[PDB]
Ligand binder design. Structure first.
Ligand SMILES: [Fe+2]
Ligand SMILES: [Fe+2]
Lengths: 192, 192
């Protein structure tokens, strides 16, 4: 049975970049609704004895949509933190300069891909099978877990992620996303 | 060069069902941006000088996404009116009872399809090639104009359509949608 993971910080710790009101709806209502819907859709099926990741890799339709959204939002909350943001250091900055030239160029390309992701979706920094990093965008509940790439960083661009704080200005939301990035989480994902 | 069509009522005329603030962003920022983006993408191409419906039926990619969203939102604003709503009469009521058994059964099936439409999209009452009426949901900018069915009525279920007024409660939005339906516009589309 799946439970909503506790949030890694206080609901107002990401302010002013993401308000406490966005967390109360996005985590308290949207992420909770996907957990409840997944639990009710899998009760009594063979999916009930699988890990979340195996459910994402072996389902379709409603089960997939809710299971991938439960995982995608837990990953997303961990990519954000108070007193973080800025430019990365260590193995992460190395790997970013290696695949994208510099941090300024990666930041440009990720922002651009997130702004152009039409409709509801997610834009990801992934490490491919071959070790090079790439920027991938998915639509709706799509996730890199259905491929051989390893997820490193994500930004939710479903309109509920930013409409309370930024209304139609998804560019304003992405500018402020950079002030919250938890580079420690990214570094752990890169080393796995 | 396409122009944003004027709204056929004042900005505050759907209140309290859809607020003046929601149409200030949805019409004044979102629908306007689709027209500006479409004009920028077709300038100097063979699409310039074609009508909006011909562009929708013959393109794909960003040209399609923006052209179809311009048409979809103008159709949506024409589907809503002050001093309307309630149950249809006449020809529309007869066709709805003939394909769905009753107006209550149609309203319940349209509300169900609209709430379940995952992600961004639109839910439509269409008149099929054989004269029967059906409910179809599309994703992102998808529209029945790319098929053989005639659009009669639509509801926008992109989150920007309701998030200011209803936050995550898309059921509440749909309940209030029914108080705004302009059955004179549905009647014009039915015998088209
Ligand atoms: Fe989300
Ligand atoms: Fe819209």
């Amino acid at each position: 049975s799946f439970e909503l993971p506790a949030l890694p910080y206080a609901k107002d710790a990401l302010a002013p970049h993401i308000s406490a009101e966005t967390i109360e709806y996005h985590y308290g209502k949207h992420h909770q609704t996907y957990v409840t819907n997944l639990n009710n859709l899998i009760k009594g099926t063979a999916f009930e004895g699988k890990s979340l990741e195996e459910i994402i890799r072996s389902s379709e339709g409603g089960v997939f949509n809710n299971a991938a959204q439960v995982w995608n939002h837990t990953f997303y909350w961990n990519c954000l933190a108070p007193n973080a943001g800025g430019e990365p250091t260590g193995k992460v900055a190395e790997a970013i300069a290696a695949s994208f030239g510099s941090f300024a160029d990666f930041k440009a390309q990720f922002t651009d891909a997130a702004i152009k992701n039409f409709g509801s979706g997610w834009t990801w920094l992934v490490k491919n099978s071959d070790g090079k990093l790439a920027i991938v965008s998915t639509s709706n509940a799509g996730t890199p877990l259905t491929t051989d790439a390893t997820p490193l960083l994500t930004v939710d661009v479903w309109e509920h992620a930013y409409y309370i704080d930024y209304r139609n200005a998804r560019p304003g939301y992405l500018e402020h996303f950079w002030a919250l990035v938890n580079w420690e989480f990214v570094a752990k994902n890169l080393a796995a």
